[PDB]
Design goal:
Keywords: unclosed beta barrel, lipoprotein, protein transport
Order of helices and strands: HEEEEEEHHEEEEEEE
CATH superfamily: Lipoprotein localisation LolA/LolB/LppX
Oligomer: monomer
PDB class: protein transport
CATH architecture: Clam
Number of strands: 13
Entry title: Crystal Structure of the Outer Membrane Lipoprotein Receptor, LolB
Number of domains: 1
Largest sheet: 11 strands, antiparallel
Name: Outer Membrane Lipoprotein LolB
Assembly: monomeric
Strand order of the largest sheet: 6-5-4-3-2-1-13-12-9-8-7
Strand content: over 45%
Helix content: 10-25%
Structural class: alpha+beta
CATH topology: outer membrane lipoprotein receptor (LolB), chain A
Number of helices: 3
Distance between the termini: 29 Å
Length: 177
């Protein structure tokens, strides 16, 4: 698609990084041969390295609560037990069985490649696909329709796959500042 070496893509990156707060919510789905997790999610982010992920059950209870800051991450599991560790990815994988690539997601959920260098844009110069190798772990990110009701537009449909595990995100809306 559209080349990343274009003023439109540079402008989009700038507009997203110029933001200081991001918040979205929607439907979350984690699928693997070991487990299937369906829940409503709430993602709140401040800057590029601080965020909160909340997964709530259909009935209203918390299935997962994760708050992350560089080198400090707190997690409340599906049984309500709270833990603190230094790395978000190791922590979510070890405590819930869902090895979600949170460190990368804090960039990808915003429509930015982050540490990834292998990616492509759609006709509107918006992130469309990403291939990220993380220790033999090739993550494949596919973007669906964007939320064009915000400025800049933000991702509203995302699918992440590792070949085995699959994570689906569908955002109802966003609030950015």
């Amino acid at each position: 698609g559209k080349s990343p070496d274009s003023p439109q893509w540079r402008q989009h990156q700038q507009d997203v990084r110029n933001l200081n707060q991001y918040q979205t919510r929607g439907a979350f789905a984690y699928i693997s041969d070991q487990q299937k997790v369906y829940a409503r999610f709430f993602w709140q982010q401040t800057g590029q390295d601080r965020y909160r992920l909340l997964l709530t059950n259909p009935l209203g209870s918390t299935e997962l609560e994760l708050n992350a800051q560089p080198g400090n991450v707190q997690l409340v599991d599906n049984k309500g037990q709270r833990y603190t560790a230094d790395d978000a990815e190791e922590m979510i994988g070890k405590l819930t069985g869902m090895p979600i690539p949170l460190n990368s997601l804090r960039q990808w959920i915003l429509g930015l490649p982050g540490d990834a260098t292998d990616y492509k844009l759609d006709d509107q110069y918006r992130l469309s696909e990403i291939t990220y190798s993380q220790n033999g772990k090739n993550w494949k990110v596919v973007y669906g329709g964007y939320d064009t009701k915000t400025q800049p537009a933000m991702p509203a449909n995302m699918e992440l796959t590792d070949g085995g595990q699959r994570i689906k995100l569908k955002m109802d809306n966003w609030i950015v500042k």
